[PDB]
Amino acid sequence: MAHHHHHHMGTLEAQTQGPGSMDDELYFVVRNNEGQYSVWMDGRSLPAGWETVGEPATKQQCLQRIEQLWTDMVPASVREHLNQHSGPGIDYAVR
């Protein structure tokens, strides 16, 4: 419905969806020495050197966050999946 193409994400933690459904499938965003982003299941200890980021939330949230950060700049491919052509509201990122 809405016509703000992408939500201005917050620095560390900023949920642009929600926690999840009703589950404990919390994930964090993680990385090390690479500068790029990945995701990891919360509660599971990380190898020495790895670092965490984002909000602990379902895989959907976790990926959606980083995909709408770095990879966000989506080409025509967005139009292909853009349902409400009049107003996306929640624009479809490109993982």
Side-chain angles (χ1 to χ4, degrees), residues 25-79:
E25 307 295 88
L26 283 69
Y27 281 61
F28 256 129
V29 175
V30 301
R31 68 174 187 183
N32 68 144
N33 191 87
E34 59 198 299
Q36 61 180 30
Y37 281 114
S38 299
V39 295
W40 186 268
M41 190 177 188
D42 177 68
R44 183 180 176 198
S45 302
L46 275 168
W50 288 74
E51 70 186 339
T52 45
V53 264
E55 322 78 73
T58 187
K59 185 189 182 70
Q60 304 172 270
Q61 246 291 95
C62 200
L63 67 87
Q64 185 189 271
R65 173 171 182 74
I66 51 177
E67 303 317 321
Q68 292 183 330
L69 284 175
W70 191 78
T71 327
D72 186 272
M73 298 190 63
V74 50
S77 303
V78 63
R79 302 180 181 215

Side-chain angles (χ1 to χ4, degrees), residues 5-16:
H5 194 216
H6 285 259
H7 174 236
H8 186 240
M9 286 295 188
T11 311
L12 183 58
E13 297 167 285
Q15 302 180 271
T16 308

